[PDB]
Write an enzyme that holds these catalytic residues in place. Structure first.
Site, PDB file in Angstrom:
ATOM      1  N   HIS A  41       0.822  -1.239   0.000  1.00  0.00           N
ATOM      2  CA  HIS A  41       0.000   0.000   0.000  1.00  0.00           C
ATOM      3  C   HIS A  41       0.842   1.269   0.000  1.00  0.00           C
ATOM      4  O   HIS A  41       0.293   2.367  -0.154  1.00  0.00           O
ATOM      5  CB  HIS A  41      -1.058   0.028   1.133  1.00  0.00           C
ATOM      6  CG  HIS A  41      -0.478   0.220   2.496  1.00  0.00           C
ATOM      7  ND1 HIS A  41      -0.270  -0.842   3.340  1.00  0.00           N
ATOM      8  CD2 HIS A  41      -0.029   1.343   3.096  1.00  0.00           C
ATOM      9  CE1 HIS A  41       0.248  -0.334   4.441  1.00  0.00           C
ATOM     10  NE2 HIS A  41       0.451   0.968   4.319  1.00  0.00           N
ATOM     11  N   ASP A  85      -0.076  -7.900   1.603  1.00  0.00           N
ATOM     12  CA  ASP A  85       0.397  -6.512   1.644  1.00  0.00           C
ATOM     13  C   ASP A  85       1.926  -6.449   1.856  1.00  0.00           C
ATOM     14  O   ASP A  85       2.430  -6.044   2.905  1.00  0.00           O
ATOM     15  CB  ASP A  85      -0.385  -5.693   2.698  1.00  0.00           C
ATOM     16  CG  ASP A  85      -0.192  -4.192   2.633  1.00  0.00           C
ATOM     17  OD1 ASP A  85       0.229  -3.682   1.549  1.00  0.00           O
ATOM     18  OD2 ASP A  85      -0.473  -3.517   3.646  1.00  0.00           O
ATOM     19  N   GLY A 174       2.264   6.708   8.758  1.00  0.00           N
ATOM     20  CA  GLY A 174       3.691   6.942   8.535  1.00  0.00           C
ATOM     21  C   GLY A 174       4.610   5.782   8.917  1.00  0.00           C
ATOM     22  O   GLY A 174       5.762   5.744   8.466  1.00  0.00           O
ATOM     23  N   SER A 176       3.765   2.444   8.371  1.00  0.00           N
ATOM     24  CA  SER A 176       3.456   1.409   7.361  1.00  0.00           C
ATOM     25  C   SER A 176       4.679   0.881   6.634  1.00  0.00           C
ATOM     26  O   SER A 176       5.559   1.655   6.295  1.00  0.00           O
ATOM     27  CB  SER A 176       2.541   1.986   6.299  1.00  0.00           C
ATOM     28  OG  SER A 176       1.213   2.024   6.760  1.00  0.00           O
ATOM     29  N   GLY A 177       4.722  -0.421   6.409  1.00  0.00           N
ATOM     30  CA  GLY A 177       5.850  -1.057   5.741  1.00  0.00           C
ATOM     31  C   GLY A 177       7.019  -1.283   6.658  1.00  0.00           C
ATOM     32  O   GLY A 177       7.927  -2.027   6.309  1.00  0.00           O
TER      33      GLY A 177
HETATM   34  N1  LIG Z   1      -1.888  -0.258  13.249  1.00  0.00           N
HETATM   35  C1  LIG Z   1      -2.411   0.864  12.855  1.00  0.00           C
HETATM   36  N2  LIG Z   1      -3.233   1.525  13.691  1.00  0.00           N
HETATM   37  C2  LIG Z   1      -2.082   1.512  11.549  1.00  0.00           C
HETATM   38  C3  LIG Z   1      -0.771   1.527  11.078  1.00  0.00           C
HETATM   39  C4  LIG Z   1      -0.457   2.135   9.874  1.00  0.00           C
HETATM   40  C5  LIG Z   1      -1.438   2.739   9.095  1.00  0.00           C
HETATM   41  C6  LIG Z   1      -1.056   3.512   7.853  1.00  0.00           C
HETATM   42  C7  LIG Z   1      -1.595   2.919   6.562  1.00  0.00           C
HETATM   43  C8  LIG Z   1      -1.094   3.706   5.371  1.00  0.00           C
HETATM   44  C9  LIG Z   1      -1.925   4.005   4.291  1.00  0.00           C
HETATM   45  C10 LIG Z   1      -1.449   4.725   3.206  1.00  0.00           C
HETATM   46  C11 LIG Z   1      -0.139   5.161   3.187  1.00  0.00           C
HETATM   47  C12 LIG Z   1       0.702   4.868   4.251  1.00  0.00           C
HETATM   48  C13 LIG Z   1       0.257   4.134   5.365  1.00  0.00           C
HETATM   49  B1  LIG Z   1       1.105   3.889   6.626  1.00  0.00           B
HETATM   50  O1  LIG Z   1       2.323   4.463   6.807  1.00  0.00           O
HETATM   51  O2  LIG Z   1       0.390   3.707   7.791  1.00  0.00           O
HETATM   52  C14 LIG Z   1      -2.743   2.760   9.584  1.00  0.00           C
HETATM   53  C15 LIG Z   1      -3.067   2.139  10.784  1.00  0.00           C
END
Ligand SMILES: N=C(N)c1ccc([C@@H]2Cc3ccccc3B(O)O2)cc1
Length: 222
Positions: A41, A85, A174, A176-177
């Site tokens: 994503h 993902d 932020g 994510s990944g």
């Molecule tokens: N565990 C959680 N609460 C959690 C963690 C990460 C995210 C986003 C998802 C995203 C969408 C689009 C672009 C970047 C990201 B990401 O860095 O974190 C959303 C929820």
């Protein structure tokens, strides 16, 4: 990362910072001098990978930068369900290794029962702000049954759940990944979770890295 604290400058050499349009988008994991593992994503145009970073607001002697040659998204990634993902990023320039730039070994064994993990990143903190300094938190692997109840019919075998019922330690926008590290091995990738960020009731959802052993190797061998 919500309800954590600044990392030790030397405890995250595998951490990657992914930039798009001049701002941090995602975290990533260096798993090979030529490869960063991240969430699918996180696919955005002209991704810039930063290795050896600790404070985003300042130029550091240990940092390394690279463009992306090839972004390889898992063939069975489903954006609507967040299933599979995972994305492999081939670095334009191979990473110059040091004491502050090192790849993280992956967990090949799906049987591994280490529940005691840690998360890290430069995502939104408890105050709703984006920190300049990388944040860390110790969290635990939540049961499939607990997760399934938190998100009805949304949890597959390609996902892991981790949190902290005590203070709600969670990954956030932020992060994510980024990595879910268990036993000094990559166990998961920050995928999705509850909004607002906090795992006090609904845990954080992670891509289950052990299931992609074969696809990762086959991509790096290509
Ligand atoms: N565990 C959680 N609460 C959690 C963690 C990460 C995210 C986003 C998802 C995203 C969408 C689009 C672009 C970047 C990201 B990401 O860095 O974190 C959303 C929820």
């Amino acid at each position: 990362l919500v309800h954590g604290g600044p990392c030790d400058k030397t405890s995250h050499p595998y951490q990657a910072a992914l930039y798009t349009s001049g701002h941090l988008l995602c975290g990533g994991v260096l798993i090979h001098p030529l490869w960063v593992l991240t969430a699918a994503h996180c696919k955005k145009p002209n991704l810039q990978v930063f290795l050896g970073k600790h404070n985003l607001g300042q130029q550091e002697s240990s940092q390394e930068q690279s463009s992306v040659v090839r972004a390889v998204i898992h063939p069975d990634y489903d954006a609507a369900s967040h299933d599979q993902d995972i994305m492999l990023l081939r670095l334009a320039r191979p990473a110059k290794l040091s004491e502050l730039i090192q790849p993280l070994p992956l967990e090949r064994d799906c049987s591994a029962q280490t529940t005691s993990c840690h998360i890290l990143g430069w995502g939104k903190t408890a105050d709703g702000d984006f920190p300049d300094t990388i944040q860390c938190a110790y969290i635990h692997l939540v049961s499939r049954e607990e997760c399934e109840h938190a998100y009805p019919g949304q949890i597959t075998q390609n996902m892991l759940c981790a949190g902290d019922e005590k203070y709600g330690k969670d990954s956030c926008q932020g992060d994510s990944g980024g990595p879910l590290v268990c036993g000094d091995h990559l166990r998961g990738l920050v995928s999705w979770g509850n909004y607002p960020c906090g795992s006090k009731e609904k845990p954080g959802v992670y891509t289950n890295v052990c299931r992609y052993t074969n696809w990762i190797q086959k991509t790096i061998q290509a």
